[PDB]
Design a protein around this ligand. Structure first.
Ligand SMILES: Nc1nc(Nc2ccccc2)nn1-c1cc(Nc2ccccc2)ncn1
Length: 286
């Protein structure tokens, strides 16, 4: 079925990077229409249109309980596509956790960790590399279900390679990046596992600003480091086993999982299939 542009009523802006807005698809014009999440380009360049269309193809091919649901495409404006998605009412996990802090216990954090793992394992079966796994890109459906959203940086692996090489990087979440992604701009399932270790760290710090991966890494390299010098010092730190600390009150077994995801050897990092099995075992034990 189709979405006519004239019937999409703007409600609220949700986020920018592209922009995501909350809209009501209301063709009956009685405000009884479905509330949807709408992604559109803000600077619709020919390269950005090409990437956005690929992102739409990626989302549409994915059907999993922990992946935001594709609803459609609104053409009504080909050079000005609007991606229609289900609206997830509790927002990003980063905001949700920061708002409802230790009132979410370890058992609840591990239910979210398991869902993120499962979503990521399914994404890997389609040979897609997220590249931007972070709590800000994880959305909350309700208190019992989280879903990976934002496939803006997602890449499809070439047919004959287990990595994707980014020739000209744009804005990059460097404090979530694997060493090989920082040094050689190489992205793989293994670099998404390293970023997953960082998500686990974010969860267990309860999004405390002073404990954030940029705040901790800046302190370790020195707050005096600026621009490209941050990337130089971060690479040297990671190569020398400088890691994010164990969050206050974090169980030993969860910190062990983080440290295994943060292995310098790409092949030694765990698989998302084993992480989901391990996390479900911890939850069972609790
Ligand atoms: N499907 C869907 N529902 C929502 N709901 C929402 C978001 C923020 C506040 C309240 C509700 N977003 N969303 C969405 C958002 C999005 N990226 C994004 C937006 C805000 C922040 C961080 C990242 N990418 C794809 N879908």
């Amino acid at each position: 079925t189709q979405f006519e542009e004239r019937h999409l009523k703007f409600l609220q802006q949700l986020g920018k990077g592209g922009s995501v807005e909350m809209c009501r698809y209301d063709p009956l014009q009685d405000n009884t229409g479905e509330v949807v999440a709408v992604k559109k380009l803000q600077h619709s360049t020919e390269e950005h249109l090409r990437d956005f269309e690929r992102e739409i193809e990626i989302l549409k091919s994915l059907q999993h309980d922990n992946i935001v649901k594709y609803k459609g495409v609104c053409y009504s404006a080909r050079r000005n596509l609007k991606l229609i998605m289900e609206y997830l009412p509790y927002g990003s996990l980063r905001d949700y956790l920061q708002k409802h802090k230790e009132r979410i216990d370890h058992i609840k954090l591990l239910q979210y960790t398991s869902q993120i793992c499962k979503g990521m394992e399914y994404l890997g079966t389609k040979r897609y590399i997220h590249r931007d796994l972070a709590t800000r890109n994880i959305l909350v459906e309700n208190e019992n279900r989280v879903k990976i959203g934002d496939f803006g940086l997602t890449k499809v692996l070439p047919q004959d390679k287990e990595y994707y090489k980014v020739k000209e990087p744009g804005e990059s979440p460097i404090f979530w990046y694997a060493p090989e992604s920082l040094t050689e701009s190489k992205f793989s399932v293994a670099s998404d596992v390293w970023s997953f270790g960082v998500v686990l760290y974010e969860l267990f710090t309860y999004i405390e600003k002073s404990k954030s991966p940029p705040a901790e890494f800046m302190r370790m390299i020195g707050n005096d480091k600026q621009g490209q010098m941050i990337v130089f010092h971060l690479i040297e730190l990671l190569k020398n086993n400088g890691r994010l600390p164990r969050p206050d009150g974090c169980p030993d077994e969860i910190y062990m999982i983080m440290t295994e995801c943060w292995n310098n050897n790409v092949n030694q990092r765990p698989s998302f299939r084993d992480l989901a099995l391990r996390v479900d075992q911890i939850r069972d034990n609790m």
